[PDB]
Amino acid sequence: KPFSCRECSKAFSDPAACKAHEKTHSPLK
Numbered sequence: 001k002p003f004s005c006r007e008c009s010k011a012f013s014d015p016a017a018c019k020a021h022e023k024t025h026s027p028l029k
């Protein structure tokens with residue numbers, strides 16, 4: 001996993017999965 005959510009320790013292997021996960025820790029709306 002080159003992409004790991006530091007906040008909630010949820011790592012991903014998809015750069016976009018982590019990107020969508022980024023947008024859920026930082027709400028777009």
Ligand SMILES: [Zn+2]
Pocket residue numbers: 005007008009010021025
């Ligand atoms: Zn997270």
